[PDB]
Amino acid sequence: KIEEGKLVIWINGDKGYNGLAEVGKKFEKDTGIKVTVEHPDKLEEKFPQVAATGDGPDIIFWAHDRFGGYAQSGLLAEITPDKAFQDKLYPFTWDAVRYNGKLIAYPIAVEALSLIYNKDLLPNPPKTWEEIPALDKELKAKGKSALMFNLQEPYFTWPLIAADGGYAFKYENGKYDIKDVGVDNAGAKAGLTFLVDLIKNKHMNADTDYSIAEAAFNKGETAMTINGPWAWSNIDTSKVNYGVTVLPTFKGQPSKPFVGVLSAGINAASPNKELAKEFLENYLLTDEGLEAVNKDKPLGAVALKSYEEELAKDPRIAATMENAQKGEIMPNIPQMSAFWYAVRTAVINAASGRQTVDEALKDAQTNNAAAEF
Amino acid sequence: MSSSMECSEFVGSRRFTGKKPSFSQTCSRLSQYLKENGSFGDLSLGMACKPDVNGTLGNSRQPTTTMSLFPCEASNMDSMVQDVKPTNLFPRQPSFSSSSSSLPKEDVLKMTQTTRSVKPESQTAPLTIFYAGQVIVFNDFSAEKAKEVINLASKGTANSLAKNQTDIRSNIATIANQVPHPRKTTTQEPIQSSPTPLTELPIARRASLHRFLEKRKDRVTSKAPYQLCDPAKASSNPQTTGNMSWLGLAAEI
Amino acid sequence: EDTLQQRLQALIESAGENWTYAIFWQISHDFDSSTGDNTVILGWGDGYYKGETNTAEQEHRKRVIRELNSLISDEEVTDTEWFFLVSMTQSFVNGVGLPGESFLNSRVIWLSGSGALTGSGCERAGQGQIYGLKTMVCIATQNGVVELGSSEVISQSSDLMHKVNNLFN
Amino acid sequence: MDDDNGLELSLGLSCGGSTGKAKGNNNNNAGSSSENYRAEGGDRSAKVIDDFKNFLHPTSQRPAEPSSGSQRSDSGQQPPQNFFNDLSKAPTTEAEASTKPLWVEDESRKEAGNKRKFGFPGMNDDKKKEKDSSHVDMHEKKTKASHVSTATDEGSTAENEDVAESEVGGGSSSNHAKEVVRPPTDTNIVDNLTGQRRSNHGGSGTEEFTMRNMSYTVPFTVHPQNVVTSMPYSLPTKESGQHAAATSLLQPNANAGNLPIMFGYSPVQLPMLDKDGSGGIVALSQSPFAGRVPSNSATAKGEGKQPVAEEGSSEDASERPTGDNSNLNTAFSFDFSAIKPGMAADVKFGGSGARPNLPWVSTTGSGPHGRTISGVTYRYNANQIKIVCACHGSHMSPEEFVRHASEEYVSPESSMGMTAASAHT
């Protein structure tokens, strides 16, 4: 049972939880109602388990792609914004969080992956993936490396896979065909083969995760990384002269990252739905609340129209939205999480060498096909 | 002697109660249960779950089938110890276990006959079962009983065992192939989570009473529970007109 | 499985009569190395229950139900629910049993009434009759067998086989 | 056309009755003439060694015995018949074997064979009357080459194979080879006057026809590997292994363990294992115990030359070394069906694998472990050992003669020349 008379919010550990806690302290000063912000590990898997039994947080912040699945299990309340509040946010941000005709999960921010490069080590970042190994043959002469990023999460490895082809689910005739999965076509095999070739020739390490790549970039040990605005962020501490630019192209075609909408959903079992509504609509989704969150950890291009003039002052947001222009809005269908797991398997067996590219993508295709059949 | 006076007191005690307190006890027991939480919409599907993992999890759980009703949930044990203070109704020496033949037929008989109990629709036959070894390379009974079986078979020429005079002996062996320990699981015996021990009740008496109650169960297997009230009005309601919801032996029909 | 779930639920939602459940038996192929025959075997594909004992059985059933609840995430378990659940464990060689007979001969087999059920000689129909069912229907399709069960007595409607032929390939 | 003497089958109970055998209006009768059996069923394979008696027991469901039971060995046209129920006996098997029929309800024919050889290496069948009429059961018998299953020796000493074979073998080409990493095994010495450069002046093979035993002395260099000893052409797999090692073990000349490779009991008596040995090993520990069925679980320790017992075998066992004869006695008081596993009999620390794996089962009701035959002559004393279990231990169990009109005991409780051994337990 969730305690009535307070708000519990879960947010990912790389996001602005202290800024959200300051917004909750403003809510506590104005209303007397305490807001507790937590950041548990594996929260996107823990949330449906405790939510099914009537437990969990009042509000969850996460990308929209899982929330439709949360909608199928009855775990989210239908939200009730009026027309004036709906006119304060961008139309495509409302379009991304629609499931079965009903609005859920208040949009917070638009996120896309960018290339972050050290201007001192590399004033001219590469435009193509293909020239990354040869560049990596030079920085090893100086004790450095070209590129390090998290190979354990398929979200970061998707832009190389998606460049020459490959897709999540086929969209045709105004609907998804969930049995038509594009993990084993020519473009996906070419992208994952290029990644495995990058690993075989010792240009990257298959064990590299978020923390190791972040620490390596913050110490000037690698010239590039691939991440979103939440790295800026202590890269902001590191005083490295960094730049934010477009992902490299592959076989003449641009990388196609998934574009994420960080959104705020209300648990259907919460007895504080009106308090959560007041907190999210009237305090968080304002200029000063989003400003307070961005000062902790930048959210990217937030959905609030009136902050856009501030967004134009940050050219890194322009680079983020340039990468978003070359990407796609994620589907919100419930099968996507299993999709992520399959792609999460498909990289790791390929990256470690325990399976080839063809066997790993074949196994992912059989997994998905068995799931629908 | 004073046995007749005790029997008269027992008849006097039983005539007052007759049927209503036992009926009320059983009804009270049923009434308290099922009131905790009703989902009314939960559905068990075969899509998310898998039959193979269900079989492995069923094998892993111990015991698979409850050998006895839980004492903490329902005070069945209280009735047994209600008027039993030691009273060694097997009056030969205890540890009735590893004590082999030299098991006379008259040493259970003396106490049991005197009890003035239910009429002997009781089979009164014990299925003593001896599993000699875990691997199946052994004479398929105890040797002392086996030599008597060999002598009777030699008298009968031991041609076909299929045409047995009594099929109960052949069937009961198939029905129960195990001793009071189900699978000898490492954690089956060290259990301290059933907070009312049975006070080391004898397995044989409990098994005989249990199988006679399973004869009560198979006679209880009826197509419709309420034959008499079915033509008048048949409807589905989460309520019971009779709290017991079953009937026992016929009173005068 | 989810789409087949939806279509099995759809099949009984538009059904004229009160059918208790619906089961799709699914074809498969196992390679028997002794006879060299890629034998077709029917097994549990999907199912949808709609609906309407003694202490030891109900405690066993409630134990199984709370084990399943523990897996996914205490009312009594009726005989139809328990028959539906235990039916997940059965597999059927092509030609063997009521669905294998329906599949091998591509015909509809309609067992209506407890007399027909006990007199058919199929063990599954007998166990169903024990467990409260009065009508059992097997209809062959392209990729398996649709089995309907009901506690009521229902006579042969062509509309049912029409719906089955429409909603399934 | 006709036979003067009636057929010996008419004993069994017959029921003369009215129409329909399914209704029991019939009179039983018993014809008192003579017994019956047949031949169907058998062990499907028997592995035996030299010097060890072999029981062979077909099973037997009752139209035969005017129908003599014939054991034959299956090569050529219409296989040579070894043994009958009729008193005919093959000249190459006189005093070597004995068939015994036994009757209606204990139904079995017992072949007993004394000294198995490579003249019996093959298919056997055991059959009722008319050999050429398909009423048969077949039994692959398996034979020769008990050996020093795990040899040492010390790196500047002299070791010796002792390698049994048979009359085929008595005129032969015996082989000693070292196993290498492929199915071929390259011969190290051969009795056809050929000897490897790597073993010259450091080996000597000598056949011995009479006791049926080759010796092979190694005074210089065996090398630690698996080692193979055999007949001609050791690709047909009639070979045995030796495994030799000197990799940080040091133990004298050829240790042993050519014990009975089966015993058969029931809870009436107490078994006595006898395992042989050699010089250095009399100092080391010796143990029997049963290796556990799970592969992960390691073998446990039972009885030992240092006085560790098992908590259920303490008073119930005895171990007895004998260093001059290099023998070891193991005495297990109360046989019960909790003991019928496979038994290891190891001669170092468990784990080192230097042990013969005995089976010890049977389903029966006689029991008696003893030297079942004995030899003595006029005016000599004799002895034997004749044993008891825990249940019959309270009652006296003195030795008694096998066949007598009335019960009598050969040896009285009083001891004048020798004293009976009664290890109370």
From Swiss-Prot, chain A:
GO terms for cellular component: ATP-binding cassette (ABC) transporter complex, substrate-binding subunit-containing; outer membrane-bounded periplasmic space. InterPro entries: Maltose/Cyclodextrin-bd (IPR006060), SBP (IPR006059), SBP_1_CS (IPR006061). One of its GO terms (biological process) is maltose transport. It is found in: Periplasm. Coiled coil: none annotated. The keyword Magnesium does not apply. Keywords: Periplasm, Signal, Sugar transport, Transport. One of its GO terms (molecular function) is carbohydrate transmembrane transporter activity. Its main location: periplasm. The complex is composed of two ATP-binding proteins (MalK), two transmembrane proteins (MalG and MalF) and a solute-binding protein (MalE). Part of the ABC transporter complex MalEFGK involved in maltose/maltodextrin import. Binds maltose and higher maltodextrins. Belongs to the bacterial solute-binding protein 1 family. This is Maltose/maltodextrin-binding periplasmic protein.
Curated annotation (Swiss-Prot), chain B:
Srtongly expressed in root tips. PROSITE patterns: TIFY (PS51320). This is Protein TIFY 10A. Repressor of jasmonate responses. Jasmonoyl-isoleucine (JA-Ile) specifically promotes COI1-TIFY10A/JAZ1 interaction. Interacts with COI1 and inositol pentakisphosphate to form a high-affinity jasmonates coreceptor. (Microbial infection) Acetylated by Pseudomonas syringae HopZ1a. A motif (Nuclear localization signal) lies at residues 204-211. GO terms for molecular function: identical protein binding. It comes from the Eukaryota. It is found in: Nucleus; Cell membrane.
Swiss-Prot record, chain C:
Constitutively expressed in roots, stems, leaves, flowers, and seedlings. Disulfide bonds: none annotated. It comes from the Eukaryota. Induction: Barely up-regulated by jasmonic acid. Residues 34-74 are annotated as: JAZ-interaction domain. Disruption phenotype: Minor effect on jasmonic acid response and no effect on glucosinolate biosynthesis. Myc2 and myc3 double mutant has an increased insensitivity to jasmonic acid. Myc2, myc3 and myc4 triple mutant has no jasmonate-related defense response, is devoid of glucosinolates and is extremely susceptible to generalist herbivores. It is found in: Nucleus. Homo- and heterodimer. Interacts with MYB28, MYB29, MYB34, MYB51, MYB76, MYB122, MYC2, MYC4, AFPH2/NINJA and the JAZ repressors TIFY10A/JAZ1, TIFY10B/JAZ2, TIFY6B/JAZ3, TIFY11A/JAZ5, TIFY11B/JAZ6, TIFY5B/JAZ7, TIFY5A/JAZ8, TIFY7/JAZ9, TIFY9/JAZ10, TIFY3A/JAZ11 and TIFY3B/JAZ12. The JAZ-interaction domain (JID) (82-141) is sufficient for interaction with MYB proteins and most of the TIFY/JAZ proteins. Transcription factor involved in tryptophan, jasmonic acid (JA) and other stress-responsive gene regulation. With MYC2 and MYC4, controls additively subsets of JA-dependent responses. Can form complexes with all known glucosinolate-related MYBs to regulate glucosinolate biosynthesis. Binds to the G-box (5'-CACGTG-3') of promoters. Activates multiple TIFY/JAZ promoters. It comes from Arabidopsis thaliana.
From Swiss-Prot, chain D:
InterPro entries: Ninja_fam, TDBD. It is found in: Nucleus. Keywords: Jasmonic acid signaling pathway, Nucleus, Plant defense, Repressor, Transcription, Transcription regulation. GO terms for cellular component: nucleus. Its main location: nucleus. Residues 20-34, 66-81 have a biased composition (Low complexity). Residues 322-425 are annotated as: Necessary and sufficient for the interaction with the JAZ proteins. Residues 37-54, 124-140 have a biased composition (Basic and acidic residues). It comes from the Eukaryota. Induction: By jasmonate. Residues 7-17 are annotated as: Necessary and sufficient for the interaction with TOPLESS. Residues 1-207, 288-327 are annotated as: Disordered. Residues 146-158, 185-197, 288-299 have a biased composition (Polar residues). The keyword Transcription regulation applies. One of its GO terms (biological process) is regulation of leaf morphogenesis. Belongs to the Ninja family. Acts as a transcriptional repressor. Negative regulator of jasmonate responses. Connects the JAZ proteins and the non-JAZ protein TIFY8 with the TOPLESS corepressors. Component of a complex at least composed of TOPLESS, TPR2, TPR3, TIFY4B/PPD2, MYC3/ATR2 and TIFY3B/JAZ12. Interacts (via C-terminus) with TIFY10A/JAZ1; TIFY10B/JAZ2; TIFY6B/JAZ3; TIFY6A/JAZ4; TIFY11A/JAZ5; TIFY11B/JAZ6; TIFY7/JAZ9; TIFY9/JAZ10; TIFY3A/JAZ11; TIFY3B/JAZ12; TIFY4A/PPD1; TIFY4B/PPD2 and TIFY8 (via TIFY domain). Interacts with TOPLESS. Interacts with PAT1H1. PANTHER family: AFP HOMOLOG 2. Unlike the JAZ proteins, the stability of AFPH2/NINJA is unaffected by jasmonate. This is AFP homolog 2. The gene is AFPH2.
